[PDB]
Each structure stands twice: as structure tokens, then as C-alpha cells.
Design a protein around this ligand. Structure first.
Ligand SMILES: OC[C@H]1O[C@@](CO)(O[C@H]2O[C@H](CO)[C@@H](O)[C@H](O)[C@H]2O)[C@@H](O)[C@@H]1O
Ligand SMILES: OC[C@H]1O[C@@](CO)(O[C@H]2O[C@H](CO)[C@@H](O)[C@H](O)[C@H]2O)[C@@H](O)[C@@H]1O
Ligand code: NA
Ligand code: NA
Lengths: 989, 989
């Protein structure tokens, strides 16, 4: 018959296998003295739900617009009430049938009016630095072309189309296209023109592209300089000036500079330079460095380097994929302030402005092409575009635009073909193209474990164990002897590791020890830098972050989008505090006798001259001694023993026995830097003079007996339950054993290996650990001292429908001033459920106090939380915080806020102070219960109930990274066992 | 030191392994002419949360009661705002550590005042017919004893304690005791004095116990009568009178009555009798029947019987375990009215009054002892009381009281030791005791598959397949040759089968065919008769049933308590309608030529004389012919061919071709009976003259084209979606393919076998079947007839993140009056997800109409729902119901209401009528969407939205019984396939 469907031509274009049409050749992002007009500002915007109902009403001419409204550009339009964000991890949000697109496909018509002065004639262009995902461009009604590659730049020649005076730019943006099948990053799906739109004049005799080659000969100190310049793709005459180095040379020739200060993340030396032609000049920052793989090590400027990296997505909790420049500068400074030295642009090229900042502040950058076909894995990679020859030109284009834009920046030390895109012919073509075009940077790609087309062996979330076998070069061989030989000669990098989702990450230290031990290990990049939380303001409410599912998604992946070291507003999570410590570039081992400290320079190039070394002895009531010690500069990878002043050692020696004292040695910045002010802490070490164990009280007060109550000094017990009802007047609503905590995100992760594939959280629910019950066995008052008496309360703890349990005996003693509490724990029966051993989250006590706590003070590790396999950033000392500040504002509330390694603690309830002491314990204080915490999906769900939930733990479980990667390591797991521990309690005024 | 805990003595008694103390010997429940005073009425009640805080304030004396309030007795106290019900299936609600009890243990102090006249002196007793679970009894302050066995009777001698005039009865009831470990029935946990409390005078020279022995010699017709009578446990002189049989004999002698009419469930002949002594006389109903196992068949009165049974719990949606007598009489009549002939008192003895009703109405009863230790299975039966010698006396006591109470009733044909209590020495002791005491009734117990201590082989939920191997005597052998030999000589019964939870049960017919084919198969008892729904009235609302979890339970099992053939108010579920048909005692096969019908008498004893056989020919507009045919009585298990009047056959022959007509032959009661009025339908059969397929309309109307709309006769299409937007003025908001339905309770059940252990509902969610999306491929108007045109709309249906899909092509045609719709379905790709083939719930269409439907009429199967493996009770005919009555009020809303086998349908939306015809299809109409249905946990969650959701299915899946037992049988499963089907639509006035 004949087709009657609508929009078939618009759809046919969206389903195209090809790159965008009509665009100028890909080139570098260059600072040019050519006239430019940024068209950023308030545009006009119309949204349609699909191509078949996108109007063809001549809107491109900007005349008589109906349905258009104001919208900022650049922008991610769902961040402005036009639709909503949608998060999927691996899942595609549309049926998988490439190259077809769903009928529900938001279409965004953009339009802006602007004026073009005579300086933009006769030749100019329009530059688009990012359009997600498919754009069509008209200028004054004539089509310029289309864009493919959402995070890549497109330029369109407007000569003869741009008219002097007023002009109308019209861009139609479709959210979904065939390109969506290759942009499946675990991300918020956010359409829009989300990066700059610029009008640029192109004068005659100008410069289109530049290719800086700045090598370094580390033997001679020579810099190897060659700056190419082209116009229309052809080499052209141009002069290269580098004033600081007394250099005038022509573009296209290679010279040897006798002496250059090499560039590195530690010392990011940049020489200002200009390459100029008659009609145009462009400014450049040149960093001399050479990259090479040698003896299975990734070496820069002749030395193996250690990558202390993070995975950086581009996200802003209000603007989506638009990251304001001042937030970029801030977050990169925050990285430096936490000893980070490397960045992977997961999983697409960043904003062009990012590259210069990385050059200046100092980061080894893995710049990654915009490619990910993850969602094809669930079907065994059938139809994977990475191996579909029809996608070759589209994927080579993505790699070309990636490389051409940023090829001049010294901070880029690796090109990455993409992420989690399988294996395929098109990936090899992208590698073949990159190796030919820019052989000065090694190629990275984790998705092909055989590593056939790369120069480094990359993996994500490989266990500490496998990492140690790789570091020794004894990993299992590949079937192909030749490929195995190639890969074994490669250095190894973890492009993603220690997944930082929620409470965690655990096991960072074990990775780091391997990084330091095995040169083949290049280091790793944490997943990930930031949480992609989106700010939602509650009706009649405060703000909170929303994640997957909180925006009406039919298909989503929950809070896996919030899996970062900082929150969306760049506030650190405890994991960043620990990370900073783990990757600290210096090691300070303070001598036990306080006579000195061993200092190892862990940096790769710089000495210790930039650091001032300070010490302080702190005690119960403030600092006792402190100052600065001068340290002869220590070479990279060298060690020395630094003497401390005799007054410090003499102080420790003369310290009365049992008095706590902490010696802390810090390496701070001796002077301001581009990323921190002087005195910023870089590394630290400590030696602690522990306090003696608290003497148990003498049991001189006897037990006392009423019909329904018992009294033993300051403690009142309920004769029915045997549990205290008050201590020093503080009401005790409950006291019992704890074996469970509100599951972390990691506990909700499935722990692979072994026949048990339930997450730990599910193992606990099945075992009934969240619903413990206690039965009283007996109460007995026993003879103490000088007529006094101890009180022993025997109980058994278990759960409904379970035969296993634990016998808990509480022995109380008092001298009227302080209470002595001995808890003894003993296993009864075999702790097996559903064929698998039950594991405990902890061995502790929960005190529920009938009054609110305003302040928590303790001596131990702090100020932030610490768990068995975390808390590296928690140092020994005295701390004190308001109850609200003890918590951690994770987006999905979960177990957090424990303070491991506490020797003493003090809770201030109103006018009174409850003091806990005894053998080391973990401390947690909350204004709500564990069941409220576990039930809470968002922070607003946390409601204080006027009580205080005090948790004192004799043993804790680790937190691991089971949400993605290794679970809790063996040494940190907690199997049911017998245990016993003492405490001493006291209430004042 | 010394114990300081409270309540230790009260707890020590609750933890006792022994039976109740101080009670009189167990005996029969006897109707006696001795004076009696029922103490039922308004008592005074105080509730304490545990033994340690249960006051010892002399309350037993009834003087100066504080904290007491009014409470009815008998009662289940949580049904009156004192605590709340709690439902667990297998789980114990308390830690499993027998014989210990939790600290949270409601204690119910009961107290009543009453007057004792001179007739209760010098000797009387107090009778308690049920106390859950542990009772202590005081009369005027002196302790009588304690009760153990919650559903068993206890009697306490009050001679010398009962004082003439006013007396005070005091009973302390603890919910939980050591006896809870053996009362783990899948049930609402409901403490209280829930059965009668009676004061009985015991005159001298009276009668304490009686043991009727009424056998039947089926060869001679002789009745074998021996009535024992005892006092204080000793045989006594007494006279036995049976007037109808002209009998005077002494108690203790066995006589041979020359001729008796034997007792059976079909013919429950009962002879009134009295056994009397000087001081007392007791009235008895005697039914002569003998029970024997012979040739591996369970025979009564010389013939193998077929059990058409149900499992009867005792529950009332407002009174808990208290079942008012008028509800007992009603529900038992309802059973008879649905061809049921057997009852298992799952899993405890019923109220004593139940036994006489079973004798009179006619049920083969399996009377089950109060014993279940199910909750010990999860620990491998460790500590199972059934094998703990310390529990022997307690369990033998339970069996003794069970047997002694009901040993006189002819309806009891089996003693059952308990339910799901494992194997053990104490079960053997209970069997040894019963076999000695009453050898006239075989012993039943499913929990020991070896069947070492039973006389019948019993299983629950054995598949149809295994049942067929057992019926043939070829099941796998037991390791012990001797035990195997014993069990192979046993008949086989299904004490529980075709789990009737929610939509279902499917597969009933396949079981029944085996019951009829293999004599060794005794039949089966459906699980279960009733749902244990509890009525909750919403604040400012209507009532609805609550189930597990709806009462604050920490540990519960959800709606598994609502798994019955009738709801808690005894309203039938569709499953009972199908069950009645499946077990109908006669088979009527109507001849195709309407000349007659084959009649098989499926009863075991009775002929067909009690039934009148009626026929009716019904057509489009009412009945055309009908009457009664006289049938010579047909013997049990015999057949005959019954001629119909020639007018019926002549009517079919002269019927115009294509006209529908239905001949129905019914067997109704010729006269009133004790359980139904005359004309009650017992069995039926049918022969249908099918209507010819509807001629497709001639495609003479052409297609019409506007910018955004298409019109083809009465249909308007959206040119963008290709889907109709209106038909005859009726708005069509959506039209699409369906492959999914809101999971039934069975679909939420895990289907064992094969590597896929996900419930079908989970297989569907993972596959995305609930979230289908459609993409338009093209629209094409093609040449029809005489200038007209057909319209073909090509689509593809799939789900996000999936590569498999289905191509759906809609071809429309019209002649202006009726619309022709041809749907073609074709698989695209392999329908595999997570390594397992995806199965479909259906192949159909969902019409969403923008107006409400008030009436649904159809020709097909009805009036109630029918699915591929159900609907046996749905007969062919013409039906018409209001939209609300098309639904099924399952407690947890779920898929239901489909009408399979529909030839035509008519929806009345306001003033207009939408007519659907075509090849047979399934019909469903709802005022809400599937997603609302699936999300609804309770019926109030179902909100009408002003639309009509019309479902027309070409193929449906079965419903099975996967919630517990077999899933959907192979012949009823629905695997992805190609399919095509036609429909014709029409709208009038
Ligand atoms: O170094 C040249 C100097 O001139 C500026 C400002 O006038 O740019 C001009 O010079 C260009 C050639 O370099 C001409 O195209 C044109 O006259 C104008 O752009 C600066 O950009 C630059 O510092
Ligand atoms: O058959 C006796 C007749 O008497 C009643 C009513 O008076 O009961 C009485 O007779 C009993 C002996 O059967 C005596 O214990 C006493 O006189 C009194 O219970 C009826 O029960 C019965 O029909
Ligand atoms: Na890792
Ligand atoms: Na069954």
C-alpha cells in the first residue's frame, strides 16, 4: 500500500550507524587570539515526547514560536523540570534492539538569537562541546549537520551562512539514539546541550590544529620539543616562542633544549608558549615528560610511578552534567589536599577546561573515550557494537575526537579506548588508529582481559590476592602463548578498586602494601570520586539527596549512583579521610621511646624540602610540648632516622605510669602551594603511651532487696528482668547483647565464592540476628568484699524458631562511686542456619537511655568513624563532638558512626555525664534505634525519639567492599565465639 | 548466694514435661441425664505480660479484684483486644530451647462466680473442654489441678470442695508452655479458655464411661453390638436399650442383631439408644459399620470407599477458635452440598459437639490427636519431643484423651497420631496404646513415611505422577524389606493435597482420575476447608480480612493462613465450585446426538433412587425444552445408558446450522435431606451445539487519512502510535499485547525441581514481562474489497534491557458495522533470561477504555472464573453479571476473574454495548489496572480509576498449586510461541 506512519525520516537518522555529518575535522581545543562569542545564556526550549510528534512548524527560523519557554544553555534539561533524571547501572532503559530507539524519546528543540559583528567574516564556525545524545543543527534555517558522541566536540563551518547582524541558531536534541547503545555508562541519563556553544572567527593565515611533542631525556636533562601546526589539515609556517627557555623555532621542527625542569604530578612544571601565524596566535602550556613501559613497569621521566587515583565522573547535584568551573577548581584542589595524584575520566572525555587544570595542579590523567556497551553483557555480548563492523566508523570517530582534542596536555599519560565494552574488531581499530596518531601515550582498556590491543594490563576490583599474584608475575597464563608473553611484560593497573559505596571502603591498606612491594603494580583508581546525589527539597522541608528510583524510573539501580568518596556537594565521606592516609606520600614511624622517627620519602621525583616536620605531645589536659625539627632533604624512595629533641623522650620517661599521652609527628606544607595553604597536613605518625587498665571497683557495697527492685550502689535493677533500670539517676530503658547492625551497602552485596550467594544482610535476617530475644535464667547475689556483694544475672539470648543461642552473664560490682560490669559470652549450640555458618556483625551491648545526649567525648581513634578494616585516617587522641556530628550523612541510612579503639568515653545527658572505661571498645551513640536506621531509605526517615542508644562493642566486624569487589577479608570477619570483657561506669553531678 | 529472680515456681510448672495434674481419668463425652450447669457467660479477666509479674494477690478468692474486667468465656482472648493474634506457619514464635518459655508470655487470670444447688452434692466435677495452652484451676481458693493439651478435655473432682450456694472458680491461663513445642500447628496463636466450662453432678450408681462397639457383617446383614459401661474405671451392671431394633441387653455382652441398616457417609443410619444404671442414664446414637484393610484397600462395610475430603480447622473471623454451633451446622451442610464426604480434624480434636453432627449428616472422619512438632524440622529434628523419652507420658496422654472422648462415634473411621511431628519413640508408644485400646479403627500418621506404626500409607502433596506410581504399587522400595512389604500392603491416602491457596487449585482433575482408576488410592483431603481470615474494620471504613503480619507480628508467615476453599465467613471460593464438580458422585456423559446420556453411579453404597434426573435445552433467548426422565435405580459402581425424549434429539437435528444451543442433564435431590432441600444439584453433564465462527467483515470501507488521525469505519486511529483511539465513540486509551498477569499465590511459590528455584513471579519480574514496551515499525493501508481497504499496523514488543521480543501485526478491516481484527504474533530472538527459558502467563490483548463498564455478558463457561487447569465447575451457557461480581474477593488481590472458553462477549458502558466475538478466547474485565492489582496487598488498596481494562486472551497459563505442592502441569504451561487469532468487534446505540 503505502506508509502512513509519522516521523519515519527523523527516526531513520537517529538509528544511523554513522558519525555526525557536516562537521569540520576533529582538532585540539586551543586557546586562540581569534575573535569568539560564547552563545551560553538563556535560550528558548520546547520539549516533545517523541520524533513522531515533534512539530515540523518551521520553528528553526525563530519566528512565531509557540510552546517555547526559557531554558539555560549549557544545561541537562531534566535538571530543570523537563522530564526527570533516570539512573541505571548496567541496564539499558530501552529495549535492546540496536540501532532502534523507543517511541518514548524526549526531543528538545533549542533556539537562540545572537549578533555577529564584522570580525566573524568572511570565515567563522560554531563549536558544540557536548550534546547528549543526537543533535541536528540549523543556522538561519539551513542545516549545518548532526552530532554523535555526547561528550565530544563538534565544529560546523558557517561561512556564507552566518550573516552580519542578527542570526538564529536552532538545535534539535534527541535523548535516545543509536549512540545510546554505546553510551551505557552507569550514570544519570541526562539529555541536553550540556557544554559550551561558541561562535569562533577563523581568520585567514590562521592556525586550526596544533600538536605539542615535549619529551624529556632524564639522563641528560634535555627537553625534546617539536610543535606541529596545521591549517585545513596541512602543515603551515608558524613560529614557536617559549620565552622562559630562550627559544625561537619554526613549527614542525624538533629541537633539543639543553636543560628543562620535567613535568610530573608532584612537580607540574609548565612553560608558557605561543605558536603564531600571520592571522592567528594560540597560547600553550608545555610540560616536558616522556612515558615508557620498561621491565613491566609504567615509567614517567625514567622512574616507575605510583598512581594514587580516583575515577572522576562529571556531576553536579542541581545542574546534572554541567560542572561549574569553580566547582571543578575546588574539587581538584580537594583531591590534591588528600594526596591524590591521578584521575581517570570515567568514562568519557571531560569538559575541555579540565585539561589545563590537570596540567597546572598535577595529576596523572587517564583520558577515556566515550564508549561503553555494558548492557550487552547480559546477552553474552550478542550484537555488541564493539564487534559489529557497521559501527567501525562511528567508534573510530569517537576515539579520533577524543585524542585530537586533548593531545597537547602533559597530564594525559594514557589513552583509554572506553569502558566495559567487551571485545571486538572496532576496539582494535580504535587502538590501531591511536597508536599510529600518538605513539607517545600508552593505550588502556580493561574490557579485553587478553590485552591484545593495549600496552598496560588493566583490571577492575581484582581481589587483594589476585593482585599479589599479578605483582609477582605468576597469574594464570593465557591460552595463547604469544598474548600471554605480551601481557606478562605489561605493568598492571586497577582502573577501579576499593568500591567506596556507603560505609567503607575496607581493605584499602592491603592493596596499598602490594602497590609498595611490587614494581609491576602501577596503583589504582578508587571507584569513585563523587556520589551522583541529586538535591530534592521536601515540601515544607529540608533538602536531601535522591538516587535511582526516586524520580519515577520504571527501570533503575537504586543508590548505586551514590558510591563516592565525597557527596554531590563535595563534602568528604569518612572513606576519603582514610584514603588520604592510606596513600600518604611519606611514611612516619614514630619510635616507641619517643627518641625520633623513621621517615621514608614515598614520592617518585620530589624530595622532602617542601615539607616542615612538626611534633606535639598531647595529654589529658592539652599540649605539653611541641615544635619543629629540621630535616635534611630526603631523596625519593630513600629513608632516614630523624632525631627528636631530648625533651620529648625525657617527657615520656618521666611520665607517671598509667597516664595517657600521644606523640604526633606531622609533615605539613612549609609554604603555600597552588592547592593548599602552608601548614596543610600531608602525612603523620604517632606513638601512644597507653593508659593503664581501669582498676575494678572494690565490691564493698552489698546488694539490697525490695519486692520488685534491687539496688547495688548507684544502680537500680528490675527484679523481674534482672536488667538495670537506672544508674546515677539516668533512666535505663533497656540493656542487652548485640550481634547485628543495620546492613551497610556492602552487606547488601552478594559475596561471590562458596555455595552461599545470599548477601550478609540476608544471612542475618534468615538467622534472626535482627530480632534477638533474651530469657532470664537466674539472679544471684554473691559475697564480695568487706560485707559487700557482687550481683550476677544469667541470661540466654537467641531468636524465634532457632535452636542456637548465647549465654550472657552480667556480674555487677560497685563501691558506691563507680560500677564494675563484667560480661561473659558463651556459645550454646551450633550457629548454623540454612546450611551455612552464621557470622556476627559484632559482640557488644546496647544501652537505651531514657534521656537525650547532647555531647559525646572519648579518648581513642578519631575524630571520624573507624571499623576493623577502615579508620586509617582516625588518629589517637582526645575528641568531643555534638551527637549530631557523630553520625554520617550517607544517602541511604545504614550502620555507621562507630569509634573503634576507644579507651574511655563520656556522654553528657543534660547536666550529668556518663563515663565508660575499660579494655578497648568501640563506641556509637545515636538518637534513634537500629530498626529505625535499617528501615530508613533516606535521611528524613530518621526521627529522634528522645532516647539515647549507646553501643559498646567488644568486637566488631569489618565492612569490606562486597557491594562491588571483595567482601570482608578473613582477618576481619567475626565468627560466633566465646568472649568476655570488663567495663567500668560512673555518673557525675 | 541465693536466687533473687521472681516467678521461678510458676515458670518451673509451665516448663513441665508431664501432663496436667489432679485430673480425673480420661473418658468419653457422653450425653447424660445427670444435672449440669454450664458456666459459660461473662467472666472477669486480668492480663499480665509474664509469670514473673503475674500478681500473687489472692485473686483466686474473687474478693477485692483490681485490674479485672469483663470477658466472655469460652473465648480466644486476643480476639477481644487483649493482645492480638499472631500467625506462623512452621516457625515457632519463641526461641527453640524446650522446655523453656519466653519472658513475654501473656498470663490470663479468669474468674467466675456461680451457684451450686443441692443436686450437685455430694459428688460433682468441673469439666474444661479446651484451654490453650497451660491452665491452673482453683475452686474457692483450693487448687484442683492443671491442664495440658489445648484441644483436649479435663475433668476435676470437686467433691468436698464445691460448697452449696455460692462458689468461685479461678483459672490462670498461660499462652506459652512446654506444651507449645508440641502444638506448632500452622495456625493463629490464640490463648484462652476457648471451649465450654461445665459443672456436672455425679450421682451414685451412675455411669462414667461408655464404649460402643457396633460392627456390621455385610454378608449376613447382621449388626454386632456390644456396649461397655464403667464407673471409676470398673465394668458395672447397666441395661442397653435400642427401641427401633427391639433390643434389651446388659452392658458388657456382645450380641448379633439379625438385620441392621449399616452406617455410611452416604447413608448415615443412626439408631437411638440408651445405656442406664440406677442413678444415671446416657443417650447414644449408634451407627453399625466395620472398618478393615484388605487387598491394600481401605474398606468400610465390605466395600472400598473413595474419600472426598477436606481439612477442617476450627476458626471464626471474630471469635478465633470459638466456632458457634450454628456456624458448625451451616458449614457442614455446605460441605454436603458440595459432595464432600470426609473430614480430617487438622490437627487436633474438634469441639465435642462436632462428633454427633458428623454421625448424623454423614462424613468419614479422620480424628487427629493434638500433636505437631513441625518447627523442629529446620534443625534436623534435633530435640524433637516426638523422640524424647521425657515426653512419652505427655504424648500418650494426648492420644488417650483424644481416643477416649470420641471412641463411640461411627463417623470416626481412623485415628491420627498427629501431624508433621517427625519420627520417634513416643509416636510408636501412642500407636501401641491406640491399637491395644481400640483395634476397630485403623491408625493414620503421615510424618513417618516408613509407616512403621500405622495401618495406612499417608502422604501430603505428592505429585499426580507419584500418586499414579503408588496406585499401581510400584513406588520405590524402603530399604528395610519387611517395612516395605508392610507399606505396600497398605492403602494410600493424601491427607493434604491440591493446596487451595488463592487462585486455584489447579490439577484437581488429574488426581481424581487416578482415585477412580486405582483401588489402592483412598482419595484425598483438600488443604484446606476455610481461610483463617480475621475481620478488621477500617477507621471510617468497610471490613476486610487480615492475615499474618497485619497484627504486629515480629515473626509471621503472611497470607498463608488464608489458603481455603471458603473464606472465614464460609463464602465459597471458585475452588470449592470446581471441587464439588470434580468429586461429583455421579458421572453424566451427554450423547453428542442428544439421544441420551451415559450415567455412572460413582457412590460406594447407595443407588440412584434419591436423585431426580432433569434435562433442559437452552438457547440464545431462554429455554426451548425440558423435563424429567425416570431412571431405574442404578447400582453402586454400575452404569446404564438413559434415553432422552425424542423431542430433544429432534430439536438438535432441526437446529439451523451455526445457532448455539446447550443440552444440560442434572441429577438433583428428589426430596429434602438433612443437608439440602429438594432440587439441590449433585451432578451434571452437557452437550453443546457450538455456534459457527463469526464471518469476518467484508473490507469495503477504505482507509481515510488526516494529518494526525486515521479513520476506518467506526474506528479512529492515532497516526503516531497506530493504535485505535476510539471505536463507535467509545474512547480507547490504549491497546497492546499482554504476556503477564499479577502473580497468584501459587506464582509466588517456588517450583522445586530443575536448577531454577525462583518463583514464577520472580522469573517474570527478572524477564521484564510486567513492564513491556512497544515500538512502531510501520503502518500500511492495503487494498481490500470493492474499493475498501485493510489497515495493517506492525509493532514489536519487548522490555528494557532485553534482546528478545515479539512481532505483533494488527490487521484491521470493517464494513462500517463490525470491525475485523486479526492479530499475528511471532517470536524474535531466544526468550531466555538468567540462563532459564522465560514462560508466559498468557497471549492476549489489553483494551483500556476511557469509560466505566456496568455489566458484562458472555456466552461460554461460567458463571465463575475458569483457567486452563481449573473451571471444572464452570458450565457452558449464557451469563451476565455486574462488573463488581466478575471479580473474586481473595484476601491478597491477585490475578483472577478470567472466563476461559468464551465464544462471545458484551460489555455495557453506559448506554452503549461493546460486543466481542471470534474463535474461543478468555475474558476479563476490571475497573483497575494489573499494576494496581499486583501492588494491592489487601482489597481496600483496589481503587477504580474510571476506566475499563478489558483482557481478551488467545492463550492462558494454568494456575497449579505451586504455593505448596505441584506447580502447573506440563500440558497447561505456556512457552513462548508463534500465534495468530481473529476477533470481531461491534458497538451498538
Ligand atoms: O600578537 C597579535 C595580537 O593582536 C591581537 C589583538 O589585536 O589580535 C589581532 O592580531 C591578529 C594576528 O595575531 C589579527 O588576526 C587581528 O589583527 C587581531 O586578531 C591579539 O590577539 C594578539 O595578542
Ligand atoms: O429415666 C429416668 C428419668 O429421670 C430423670 C428426670 O427425673 O432423671 C432422674 O432420674 C435419675 C436416674 O435415672 C436420678 O438420678 C434422679 O432421680 C434424676 O436425675 C431423667 O434424666 C430420666 O429421663
Ligand atoms: Na577493589
Ligand atoms: Na497436592
Amino acid at each position: 500500500g503505502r506508509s502512513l506512519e509519522l516521523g519515519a525520516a527523523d527516526i531513520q537518522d537517529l538509528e544511523s550507524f554513522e558519525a555526525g555529518r557536516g562537521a569540520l575535522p576533529a582538532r585540539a581545543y586551543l586557546q586562540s587570539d581569534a575573535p569568539r562569542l560564547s552563545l551560553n545564556g538563556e535560550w528558548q526550549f520546547r520539549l516533545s515526547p517523541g520524533s513522531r510528534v515533534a512539530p515540523d512548524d518551521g520553528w528553526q527560523l525563530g519566528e512565531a514560536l509557540n510552546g517555547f519557554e526559557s531554558l539555560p544553555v549549557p544545561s541537562s534539561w531534566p535538571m530543570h523540570g523537563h522530564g526527570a533524571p533516570a539512573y541505571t547501572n548496567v541496564q539499558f532503559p530501552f529495549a535492546v534492539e540496536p540501532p532502534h530507539v523507543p517511541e518514548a524519546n524526549p526531543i528538545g528543540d533549542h533556539l537562540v538569537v545572537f549578533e555577529a559583528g564584522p570580525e566573524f567574516f568572511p570565515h567563522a564556525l560554531l563549536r558544540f562541546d557536548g550534546i547528549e545524545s543526537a543533535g541536528t543543527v540549523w543556522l538561519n534555517g539551513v542545516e549545518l549537520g548532526t552530532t554523535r558522541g555526547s561528550r565530544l566536540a563538534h565544529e560546523f563551518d558557517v561561512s556564507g551562512i552566518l550573516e552580519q547582524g542578527e542570526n538564529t541558531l536552532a538545535v534539535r536534541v534527541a535523548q535516545f539514539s543509536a549512540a545510546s547503545y554505546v553510551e551505557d555508562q552507569a550514570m544519570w541519563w541526562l539529555p541536553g546541550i550540556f557544554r559550551d556553544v561558541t561562535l569562533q572567527a577563523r581568520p585567514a593565515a590562521g592556525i586550526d590544529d596544533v600538536f605539542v611533542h615535549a619529551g624529556y631525556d632524564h639522563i641528560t636533562g634535555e627537553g625534546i620539543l617539536k610543535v606541529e601546526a596545521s591549517r585545513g589539515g596541512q602543515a603551515i609556517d608558524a613560529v614557536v616562542r617559549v620565552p622562559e627557555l630562550a627559544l625561537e623555532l619554526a613549527a614542525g621542527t624538533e629541537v633539543r633544549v639543553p636543560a628543562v625542569e620535567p613535568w610530573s604530578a608532584e612537580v607540574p612544571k609548565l612553560y608558557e608558549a605561543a605558536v603564531s601565524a600571520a592571522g592567528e596566535s594560540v597560547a600553550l602550556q608545555i610540560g616536558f615528560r616522556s612515558i615508557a613501559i620498561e621491565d613491566a613497569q609504567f615509567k614517567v621521566n625514567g622512574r616507575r610511578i605510583l598512581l594514587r587515583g580516583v575515577n572522576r565522573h562529571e556531576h553536579h547535584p542541581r545542574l546534572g552534567r554541567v560542572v561549574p568551573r569553580d566547582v571543578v577548581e575546588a574539587e581538584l584542589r580537594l583531591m590534591k589536599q588528600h594526596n591524590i595524584n591521578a584521575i581517570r575520566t570515567s568514562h568519557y572525555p571531560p569538559h575541555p577546561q579540565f585539561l589545563a587544570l590537570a596540567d597546572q595542579l598535577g595529576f596523572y590523567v587517564v583520558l577515556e573515550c566515550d564508549l561503553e556497551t555494558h548492557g550487552f553483557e547480559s546477552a553474552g555480548w550478542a550484537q555488541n557494537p564493539s564487534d559489529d563492523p557497521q559501527w567501525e566508523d562511528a567508534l573510530v570517530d569517537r576515539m579520533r575526537r577524543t585524542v585530537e582534542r586533548d593531545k597537547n596536555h602533559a597530564s594525559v599519560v594514557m589513552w583509554s579506548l572506553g569502558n566495559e565494552a567487551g571485545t571486538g574488531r572496532n576496539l582494535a581499530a580504535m587502538s590501531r588508529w591511536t597508536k599510529d596518531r600518538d605513539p607517545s601515550r600508552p593505550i588502556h582498556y580493561e574490557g579485553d582481559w587478553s590485552s591484545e590491543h593495549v600496552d598496560v594490563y588493566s583490571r577492575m576490583y581484582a581481589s587483594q590476592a589476585e593482585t599479589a599474584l599479578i605483582g609477582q608475575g605468576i597469574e594464570p597464563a593465557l591460552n595463547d602463548a604469544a598474548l600471554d608473553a605480551r601481557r606478562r611484560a605489561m605493568p598492571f593497573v586497577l582502573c577501579e578498586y576499593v568500591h567506596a559505596m556507603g560505609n567503607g571502603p575496607g581493605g584499602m591498606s592491603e592493596y596499598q602494601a602490594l602497590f609498595e612491594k611490587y614494581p609491576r603494580l602501577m596503583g589504582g583508581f578508587v571507584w569513585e570520586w563523587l556520589e551522583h546525589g541529586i538535591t530534592v527539597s521536601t515540601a515544607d522541608g529540608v533538602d536531601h539527596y535522591g538516587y535511582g528510583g526516586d524520580f519515577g524510573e520504571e527501570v533503575h539501580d537504586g543508590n548505586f549512583v551514590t558510591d563516592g568518596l565525597v557527596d554531590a556537594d563535595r563534602r568528604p565521606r569518612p572513606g576519603l579521610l582514610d584514603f588520604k592516609k592510606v596513600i600518604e606520600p611519606l611514611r612516619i614511624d614514630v619510635a616507641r621511646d619517643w627518641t625520633g622517627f623513621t621517615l621514608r620519602n614515598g614520592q617518585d621525583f620530589a624530595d622532602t624540602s617542601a615539607f616542615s616536620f612538626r611534633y606535639e605531645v598531647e595529654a589529658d589536659g592539652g599540649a605539653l610540648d611541641g615544635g619543629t625539627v629540621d630535616v635534611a632533604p630526603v631523596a625519593p624512595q630513600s629513608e632516614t632516622v630523624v632525631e627528636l629533641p631530648g625533651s620529648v623522650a625525657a617527657l615520656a620517661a618521666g611520665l607517671s605510669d598509667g597516664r595517657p599521652a600521644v606523640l604526633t609527628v606531622r609533615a605539613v606544607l612549609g609554604a603555600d602551594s597552588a592547592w593548599a595553604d602552608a601548614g596543610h597536613e600531608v602525612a603523620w605518625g604517632q606513638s601512644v603511651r597507653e593508659p593503664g587498665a581501669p582498676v575494678p571497683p572494690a565490691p564493698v557495697e552489698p546488694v539490697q532487696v525490695q519486692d520488685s527492685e534491687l539496688t547495688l550502689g548507684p544502680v537500680v535493677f528490675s527484679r523481674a528482668t534482672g536488667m538495670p533500670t537506672s544508674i546515677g539517676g539516668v533512666p535505663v530503658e533497656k540493656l542487652g547483647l548485640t550481634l547485628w547492625w543495620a546492613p551497610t551497602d556492602n552487606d547488601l552485596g552478594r559475596e561471590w565464592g562458596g555455595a552461599d550467594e545470599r548477601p550478609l544482610a540476608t544471612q542475618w535476617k534468615d538467622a534472626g540476628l535482627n530480632r534477638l530475644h533474651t530469657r532470664l535464667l537466674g539472679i544471684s547475689a554473691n559475697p564480695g568484699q568487706d560485707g559487700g556483694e557482687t550481683l550476677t544475672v544469667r541470661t540466654r539470648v537467641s531468636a524465634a524458631d532457632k535452636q542456637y543461642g548465647v549465654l550472657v552473664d552480667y556480674t555487677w560490682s560497685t563501691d558506691g562511686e563507680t560500677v564494675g560490669l563484667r560480661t561473659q559470652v558463651r556459645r550454646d549450640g551450633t550457629w548454623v542456619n540454612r546450611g551455612f555458618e552464621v557470622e556476627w556483625a559484632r559482640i557488644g551491648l546496647e544501652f537505651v537511655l531514657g534521656e537525650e545526649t547532647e555531647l559525646v567525648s572519648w579518648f581513642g581513634q578519631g575524630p571520624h568513624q573507624s571499623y576493623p578494616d577502615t579508620g586509617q585516617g582516625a588518629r589517637a587522641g582526645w575528641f568531643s563532638l555534638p551527637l549530631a556530628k557523630m553520625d554520617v550523612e550517607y544517602v541511604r541510612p545504614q550502620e555507621c558512626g562507630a569509634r573503634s579503639g576507644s579507651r574511655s568515653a563520656a556522654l553528657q545527658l543534660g547536666g550529668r555525664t556518663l563515663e565508660i572505661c575499660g579494655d578497648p571498645f568501640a563506641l556509637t551513640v545515636r538518637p534513634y534505634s537500629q530498626d529505625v536506621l535499617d528501615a530508613a531509605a533516606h535521611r528524613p526517615d530518621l526521627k529522634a525519639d528522645g532516647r539515647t542508644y549507646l553501643y559498646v562493642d567488644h568486637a566488631l566486624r569489618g565492612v569490606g567492599t562486597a557491594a562491588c569487589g571483595p567482601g570482608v577479608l578473613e582477618q576481619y570477619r567475626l565468627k560466633p565465639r566465646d568472649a568476655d570483657f570488663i567495663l567500668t561506669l560512673k555518673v557525675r553531678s
